Amino acid sequence: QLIKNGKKITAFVPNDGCLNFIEENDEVLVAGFGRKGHAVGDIPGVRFKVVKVANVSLLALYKGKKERPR
Amino acid sequence: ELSRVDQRHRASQLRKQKKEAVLAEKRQLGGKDGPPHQVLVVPLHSRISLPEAMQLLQDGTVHLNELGNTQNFMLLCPRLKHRWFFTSARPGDLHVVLDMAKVADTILFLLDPLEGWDSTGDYCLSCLFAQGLPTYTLAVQGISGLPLKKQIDTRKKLSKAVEKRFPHDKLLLLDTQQEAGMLLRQLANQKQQHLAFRDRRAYLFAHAVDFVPSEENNLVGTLKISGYVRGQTLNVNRLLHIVGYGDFQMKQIDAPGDPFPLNPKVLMKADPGRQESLQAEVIPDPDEEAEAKMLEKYKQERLEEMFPDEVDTPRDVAARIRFQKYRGLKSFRTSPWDPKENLPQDYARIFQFQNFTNTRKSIFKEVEEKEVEGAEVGWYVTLHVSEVPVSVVECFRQGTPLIAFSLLPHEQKMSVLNMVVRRDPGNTEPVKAKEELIFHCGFRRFRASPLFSQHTAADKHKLQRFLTADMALVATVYAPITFPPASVLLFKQKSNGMHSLIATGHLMSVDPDRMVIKRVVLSGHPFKIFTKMAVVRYMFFNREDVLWFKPVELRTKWGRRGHIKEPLGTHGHMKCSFDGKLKSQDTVLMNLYKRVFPKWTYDPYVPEPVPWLKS
RNA sequence: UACCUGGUUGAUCCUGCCAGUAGCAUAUGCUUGUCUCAAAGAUUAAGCCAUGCAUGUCUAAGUACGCACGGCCGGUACAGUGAAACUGCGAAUGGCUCAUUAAAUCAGUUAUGGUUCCUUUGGUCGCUCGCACUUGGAUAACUGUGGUAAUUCU
RNA sequence: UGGUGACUCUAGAUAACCUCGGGCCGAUCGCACGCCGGCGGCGACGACCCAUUCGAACGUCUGCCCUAUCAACUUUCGAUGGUAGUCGCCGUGCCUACCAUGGUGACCACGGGUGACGGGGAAUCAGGGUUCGAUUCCGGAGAGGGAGCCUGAGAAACGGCUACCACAUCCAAGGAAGGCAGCAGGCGCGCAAAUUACCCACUCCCGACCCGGGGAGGUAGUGACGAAAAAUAACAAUACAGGACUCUUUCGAGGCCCUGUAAUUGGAAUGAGUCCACUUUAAAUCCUUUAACGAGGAUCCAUUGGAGGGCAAGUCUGGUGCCAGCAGCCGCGGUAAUUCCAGCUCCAAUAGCGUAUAUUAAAGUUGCUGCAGUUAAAAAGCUCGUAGUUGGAUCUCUCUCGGCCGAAGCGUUUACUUUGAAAAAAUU
RNA sequence: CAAGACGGACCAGAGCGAAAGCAUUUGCCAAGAAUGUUUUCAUUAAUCAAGAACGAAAGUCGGAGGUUCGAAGACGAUCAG
RNA sequence: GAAACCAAAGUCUUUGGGUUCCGGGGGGAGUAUGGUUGCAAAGCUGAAACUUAAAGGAAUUGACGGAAGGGCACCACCAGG
Numbered sequence A: 001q002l003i004k005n006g007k008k009i010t011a012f013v014p015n016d017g018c019l020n021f022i023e024e025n026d027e028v029l030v031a032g033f034g035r036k037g038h039a040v041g042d043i044p045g046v047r048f049k050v051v052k053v054a055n056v057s058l059l060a061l062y063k064g065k066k067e068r069p070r
Numbered sequence B: 001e002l003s004r005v006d007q008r009h010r011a012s013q014l015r016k017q018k019k020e021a022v023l024a025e026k027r028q029l030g031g032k033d034g035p036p037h038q039v040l041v042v043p044l045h046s047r048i049s050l051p052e053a054m055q056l057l058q059d060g061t062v063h064l065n066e067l068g069n070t071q072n073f074m075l076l077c078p079r080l081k082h083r084w085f086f087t088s089a090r091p092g093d094l095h096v097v098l099d100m101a102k103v104a105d106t107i108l109f110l111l112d113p114l115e116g117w118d119s120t121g122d123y124c125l126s127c128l129f130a131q132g133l134p135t136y137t138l139a140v141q142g143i144s145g146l147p148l149k150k151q152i153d154t155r156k157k158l159s160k161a162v163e164k165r166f167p168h169d170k171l172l173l174l175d176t177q178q179e180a181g182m183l184l185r186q187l188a189n190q191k192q193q194h195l196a197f198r199d200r201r202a203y204l205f206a207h208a209v210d211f212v213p214s215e216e217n218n219l220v221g222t223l224k225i226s227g228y229v230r231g232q233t234l235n236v237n238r239l240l241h242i243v244g245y246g247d248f249q250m251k252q253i254d255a256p257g258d259p260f261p262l263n264p265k266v267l268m269k270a271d272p273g274r275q276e277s278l279q280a281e282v283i284p285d286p287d288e289e290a291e292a293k294m295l296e297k298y299k300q301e302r303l304e305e306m307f308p309d310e311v312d313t314p315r316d317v318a319a320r321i322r323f324q325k326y327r328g329l330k331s332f333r334t335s336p337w338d339p340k341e342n343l344p345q346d347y348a349r350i351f352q353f354q355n356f357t358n359t360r361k362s363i364f365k366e367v368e369e370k371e372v373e374g375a376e377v378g379w380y381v382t383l384h385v386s387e388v389p390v391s392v393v394e395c396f397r398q399g400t401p402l403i404a405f406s407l408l409p410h411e412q413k414m415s416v417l418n419m420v421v422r423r424d425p426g427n428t429e430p431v432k433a434k435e436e437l438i439f440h441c442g443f444r445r446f447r448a449s450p451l452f453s454q455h456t457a458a459d460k461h462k463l464q465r466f467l468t469a470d471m472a473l474v475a476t477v478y479a480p481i482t483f484p485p486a487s488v489l490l491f492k493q494k495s496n497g498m499h500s501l502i503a504t505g506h507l508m509s510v511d512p513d514r515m516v517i518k519r520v521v522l523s524g525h526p527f528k529i530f531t532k533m534a535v536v537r538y539m540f541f542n543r544e545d546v547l548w549f550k551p552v553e554l555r556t557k558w559g560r561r562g563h564i565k566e567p568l569g570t571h572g573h574m575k576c577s578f579d580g581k582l583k584s585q586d587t588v589l590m591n592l593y594k595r596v597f598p599k600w601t602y603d604p605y606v607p608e609p610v611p612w613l614k615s
Numbered sequence C: 001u002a003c004c005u006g007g008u009u010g011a012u013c014c015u016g017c018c019a020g021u022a023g024c025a026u027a028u029g030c031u032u033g034u035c036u037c038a039a040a041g042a043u044u045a046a047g048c049c050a051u052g053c054a055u056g057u058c059u060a061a062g063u064a065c066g067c068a069c070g071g072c073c074g075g076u077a078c079a080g081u082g083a084a085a086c087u088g089c090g091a092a093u094g095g096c097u098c099a100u101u102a103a104a105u106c107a108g109u110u111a112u113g114g115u116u117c118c119u120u121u122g123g124u125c126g127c128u129c130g131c132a133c134u135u136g137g138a139u140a141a142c143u144g145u146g147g148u149a150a151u152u153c154u
Numbered sequence D: 001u002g003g004u005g006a007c008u009c010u011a012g013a014u015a016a017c018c019u020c021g022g023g024c025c026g027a028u029c030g031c032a033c034g035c036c037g038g039c040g041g042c043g044a045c046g047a048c049c050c051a052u053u054c055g056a057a058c059g060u061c062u063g064c065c066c067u068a069u070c071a072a073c074u075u076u077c078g079a080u081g082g083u084a085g086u087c088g089c090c091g092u093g094c095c096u097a098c099c100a101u102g103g104u105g106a107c108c109a110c111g112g113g114u115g116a117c118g119g120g121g122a123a124u125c126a127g128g129g130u131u132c133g134a135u136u137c138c139g140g141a142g143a144g145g146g147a148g149c150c151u152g153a154g155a156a157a158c159g160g161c162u163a164c165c166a167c168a169u170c171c172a173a174g175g176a177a178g179g180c181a182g183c184a185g186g187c188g189c190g191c192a193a194a195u196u197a198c199c200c201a202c203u204c205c206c207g208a209c210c211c212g213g214g215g216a217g218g219u220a221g222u223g224a225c226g227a228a229a230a231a232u233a234a235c236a237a238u239a240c241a242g243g244a245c246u247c248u249u250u251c252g253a254g255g256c257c258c259u260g261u262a263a264u265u266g267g268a269a270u271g272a273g274u275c276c277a278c279u280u281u282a283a284a285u286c287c288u289u290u291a292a293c294g295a296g297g298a299u300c301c302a303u304u305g306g307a308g309g310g311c312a313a314g315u316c317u318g319g320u321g322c323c324a325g326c327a328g329c330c331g332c333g334g335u336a337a338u339u340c341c342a343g344c345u346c347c348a349a350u351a352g353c354g355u356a357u358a359u360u361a362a363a364g365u366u367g368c369u370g371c372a373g374u375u376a377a378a379a380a381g382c383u384c385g386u387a388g389u390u391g392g393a394u395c396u397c398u399c400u401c402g403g404c405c406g407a408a409g410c411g412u413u414u415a416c417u418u419u420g421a422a423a424a425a426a427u428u
Numbered sequence E: 001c002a003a004g005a006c007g008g009a010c011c012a013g014a015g016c017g018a019a020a021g022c023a024u025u026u027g028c029c030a031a032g033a034a035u036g037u038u039u040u041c042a043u044u045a046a047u048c049a050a051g052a053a054c055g056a057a058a059g060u061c062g063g064a065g066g067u068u069c070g071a072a073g074a075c076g077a078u079c080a081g
Numbered sequence F: 001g002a003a004a005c006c007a008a009a010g011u012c013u014u015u016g017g018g019u020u021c022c023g024g025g026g027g028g029a030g031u032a033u034g035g036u037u038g039c040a041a042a043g044c045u046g047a048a049a050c051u052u053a054a055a056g057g058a059a060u061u062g063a064c065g066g067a068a069g070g071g072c073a074c075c076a077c078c079a080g081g
Helices: A058-062 B005-026 B050-057 B094-101 B119-131 B148-162 B177-188 B288-306 B356-368 B391-398 B544-548
Strands: A028-032 A048-053 B037-043 B061-064 B073-077 B082-088 B106-111 B136-140 B202-215 B220-229 B240-242 B246-248 B252-255 B266-270 B380-385 B403-406 B414-423 B437-441 B445-448 B451-454 B461-464 B473-480 B487-493 B499-507 B516-529 B533-537 B554-556 B561-567 B573-578 B588-596
Touching (some): A048 A058, B037 B050, B037 B119, B050 B177, B082 B177, B119 B487, B136 B177, B414 B437, B437 B473, B445 B473, B544 B561
Parallel strands (some): B037 B082, B037 B106, B106 B136, B461 B516
Antiparallel strands (some): B061 B073, B202 B220, B202 B403, B220 B380, B240 B403, B252 B380, B414 B499, B437 B445, B451 B473, B487 B499, B516 B588, B533 B573, B554 B561, B554 B588
C-alpha cells in the first residue's frame, strides 16, 4: 500500500530466495518493472518490482553484503 | 475534480489531516502530559570513555540517580520544555544493553574518530539491529581533539566507515557544551520510529523497587516497582512479566506524587478475585572429547549438505523395525497428512486457538478501540507485587535495570511457537537440529530445543537437521505464547558463559497444527539393468523388508520414478519397475517420512552473560 | 554517420504494433586512487517554524556642557578625540520563491504633442518698488522619582 | 521670438486672481585669511523652477498551449459610443448624470482547463521538425489569506502599521507579541536536494562617508548532478608454447625471425600516501614548487553488467531438476539445462557501471517537406448549399519654386523579393 | 360473379434516375441527359464546416382494405439427451 | 502493386493540379456518461479504466481426406495340382 495516496499495488520480489527478506508490514521502495505500464513477462497484471527493503537494497541482501534491520 | 480552487481546497484538506495526525503523534513524548524521553548511550569503540561525554552531556536541572555499576540520571529543562532520562550502557554486556534498549526511546551511539567502531561494539550493533532500533543517533568524540588538517579527512574517513552499516546519517560531534545543545535539540525533534512491540502492551520502566518480605525464610515477598508507564493504559487484572525473571501475578497499583514534574500515596486499584488472570501455564488436567564431537558435527554437516538426508540402512538391525513409525509419500506437496493422527502427551499439555487471526484481531481491537479503567500513560505509578524472589532486588543493586510489562490476555500459557529466522554470517559454528539454544523472543529469555524447517507456503515442512547459512528457516518449539510481530534472537554458550549470536528473525503465527516432517532417504546401487526393469542391491538386507515397503515409490537422483515389483533373493536383492532406463553411474533411493515433535526443554531462568569478545 | 534488428506462419510476401538501439534528465543500486570546474528543498506542501544573523550611517564642514578621556591656561564664548541624543539620508536596492496569471505577463515595434521624477549634471538663485552687527517658543541627550509579571512599553 | 510633420507649443501684451492645511525670493556651516571706519577668495549644505540622467506609468502594431461533451457572449450591478463633470500625476466608462443601442463571434468569440510566470534560452536533430524552459540574465508577481493605509520623490511596503480570517508564543489570566517564498537549521512532506562555518580582502551597493555597514557577495565544508584531464605499470635477458623461413624423405636442428605466456631473474623511473619548508589567502584549505621516507605483483590487488538469438563473449565443469528461478521481446527449465545457481574461462564499458521513470532520434508508426483509405484500420447512403480553400487564356514618370540638379506630386492599392538601420549581455 | 394483389415469359453484362430504385395500354402534367448549332450571357466555376430535400426493407402514430404469404402464438413427427 | 489484380488502384523517394471526408496494433466499444433529435424503438456525436503480442491481408504447397480412380504380385486371387 503506497504511503502517498493509499492505493493497493502488487509488486514482484525480483531474485530467488529474496521474499524471506521482506517481512510483514515493512517499508518497501518499489519501482516500475520496465514496460511503462504494460505487464512484463510471466507475471500477469503485475508491473512493479521491489528495489529496497527497510532502506537496504535487495541486491545487497541477495549478494550477502549488508544486513536488514527492523 | 476540476475548478482549480476545488483541487487546491481538497489538497489543503488532506494537508490539514496529515498535520493533525503528526501533531497528535508528537505530543505523546517529552512534555507536560508526556512521560520523560529516555535516551540510552552506547560507546561502541573501546577507546571512548563514556564518563567524558557523559559529563559533557549532563549540562538544565539534573537529578543524579545511582546504582551498583551503571550511573543514570534525570534531566529537566524549561528552556526546551523537555524532560530527559539518560541511561548508559557498555557494549559486550549484552544483558543490560538488550533488556533496557527495548524500552529506550532513542539510542545515541558514540564513535571514535580514527576507526569506525570496536568488534565488540560491532557485535552489539548487529544484535541491536536484529532486535529493533528505537532511534539511532550517530555521535563522535575526538574530532576536535585533532587539528583541522587531519580533522576534515577524519570526518571523511568516518563517513567512509559508517556507510557499510548505517546506510546514510550525518555524524554529529560532541566536544563542547554548545555542541551538546545542538545534539539535545536534535534528539528533541526526531522522526520517532514506533516500535510496535513496545506499543501493543503496557510496558513500564522502574526507578524505584522496594522489597517487603512476607516471610524472610520463604525468600519471597512484596515488591515495589515504581516508575513510568510507557505503553498502553495498564490494567491490574492482566499479569505482569519481568524481562529476566518471568511472568507472574501483580496485586496492587497506587499512584504517588511524581518525583520530577516539568512545571513545579493514594491507591489506584486492587485486583478482584474473579476478574483476575489465572497463573496456569499448562493444562490442569493431564576437553578433547568436545573437539572430537565438534569434528563429528562438521563431518555430519558436510555429509548432510552434498547429500540431503542419506541414511545408510544398518544390516544388523531389521529395517522394518528401525523405521517402524515411518510412512511413504507419493509426492511431498500433494499427499495429505492428518494433523491429529499421532500426538503425544506433550500436546495434551498446551493450549490451541480455534482461529488465531480472529483472536489477534479481537485482542488488538479491544486494546486499541476500547479504554480500560487503569492508570494512563506518562503517570508515575507504583506496583505492589505479591510473589517475587528476593534476588531480583539484589540484581537491582548489581547494575542491571528492572523493566515490567503488562501482558495481553492469553500470553502466559504454553503453545508451539514458529520463528522465522536466518543465520547471522558472523558465526559459522554448526548447530544441529535438536540443540539447546537461547531464544530472546521479545522480552523473554529461555533455553529451548527447537526444530528447523523450510519457510514455504505448503502444509508439511521437511525437517532440517542443520542450520543453513543462507536459507531462512522456521524454528519451532514449545514456548510461552506471544502475539506477533516479535523480534527473535538466537544465542549459544560458546565458552565461559559467552553468549554468541547465531541467527535472528521475527515471530510468525503461533499454532501447534504446523507439522514438521522428518525424512530419511535410503540409497541403493542398481547392479542389473533391463529396459525399464532393474535389479538393485544393498537397499535392504532381509527378504520381508521389501515386502513391508512395497507401496512406497522409488525416486532417482537422475530423476526417474519407479515402483518395485518383486523381491528375488534372500538378501537385499530387489526387482524394480521404472519409467525409463537407468544410467550405469546411477543410484536409486526411497523416501521415508515420519512426524517429529520438539523436545520439552523450557526454563525461564537465564545465566548472566559475560562481556563478549572476539576469539 | 540522412542506418536499423528480433517477434504472427507449415514456409513466403506484407500491413502493423511490441521489443531491442542511442541520447538526455531526475531518483536509486553497487563500486570509487589523482586532479581542475561545478549543480544542489524546483517538482510533493506558496505547508509550519525553536535559535542566531540578514540595514545601517560623520566629515575641516547641522547640534557636544556626557572630565568619558590624555589635555590646554587658566575669568581666556567654543582647544582636541568623542559615547549618547536630536537632525539629515537610507531602509522602495538587494536576496527569495513561481502560487497567481492565456492578449494577461512577456517579446520585438512605436508613442507621451497625455504624465510623474529623489539623486546626479548644466542653467536660474539682489527680475519683485513693498532686531538684521542676528528673532521666538519648545524638546531630547543628562539629573532625579517611578509603574507594570512582561516587551526596542513608557 | 524660436521650433515640429503637425499645438490649444515656447516666447510676448493686457485685465485680474495668488488658498492661514500658505510658493520661491539663504536668520546655516568649514577653510585659510587679506586690502582702502568698509570691502573680500575657496568649499560645504540649501532652494521655487527649467533642462538632464535613472527610471516609473500608461497607450500602439504584431505574436500564446489544450478544449465544441464550451456556439453564441456582453448589457438591471458600464456592456459599446456621445456631451458635461468627479477623482486622478495624467488620456480614457476611471467613476457619476443625461442620451444613443450598441460591442465580439466558425479568421473559434465567450466558458473551461493548464502537471502555465513569459522571454533570452536547453536537449535532440541530415532538411523539416519534436520536446523542455521552476532554475543564477531581462521583464512580472507575492511575502500564511484577503483588505485598508502611514511616511516618502518612489510602497497599497510586509526583516512598516491597522483590522478580520487560519494557525500560533509568554503569562502573575489584567494583558503582551507574531510572519524564514532572506542565510544556516529543524519538523513535515516525500523517489527526490548541503554548514545553526569564516570574512567584507575581491565584486559592487548604502550612508553624514579616502574611515562605517553588508548571510548582496566572496571563501572553505557536504556534493559520483553533470563536465575536462588522467594513474592501477615500462624495458631487457632467460624459460616454455605456437607461427612462418632455411637445412633435413620425415622425425628433427638452427636463426642476431615473429608472436604470445611466465607469484621467472635483473636493474633503473615514478606517482598515490606520511611529512617539513615556501607559496596561496582576509586567515586558512586546495592546486603548483622543494628537502625526507615511500612499489615486485603471492599487492599501493578495479569495478559493474553479461556469455541462447537481437547482441560481443563457452554447445566448458559441478549443483537444482517446468521446482527454485531466468527472461525488456522471442522464449528456457519437465535430466547431456548452450538461458537457473556456483567455479573457471571469456566479452562490454572502464573509475565508473546497472535499474526505474519522463522526454527526444529511430517514427515516412502524426507525414509541411513526406503516410494511408478495393481486399489489411479506414470514402460520409445520396444530392443541394453558406463561410473556408481554390480558381482558364489575355495588355512591352513628370509640372511648378530655388542652386545640368535640389524641393513637390508620384504610381490603384497590397502580397513577393533585394538592400539598408534598428534590434541587451550570457548561450550558440 | 366479387375481392385485393402482382405486372412473369419478352428481360439483354441493356436503359433511365443524385442514390434508394424504376417493366400492362391510353391521355395529361412538369421535368431530364446526350446529340446538332458560324445562338446568347462572359468567368457566372470545383469541392464543401454550418444548414437543407430525398432516402430499400423493417419499425411507430391516425384512417381504409385485407387475395396470398406470414413475425408472434397454436398443432403433429424425431429421438441415450 | 504485398499480391490478388488495376487502362486506373497509372503518370509515387524522378515524391507538389484543386478540394472534401476519414484511419493510426488488437479488445474493452460504437460501451458508459453528457448533449441533441425522436411518441417510442432508436439515431448523431462519443470516452476511459483495464486487457493482449499479436489480430489481420494476399497469394504457395499438402501432413490428411473419414475423396475417387487405376495399376501391381501363385510370399494375392480364378482354373486347378
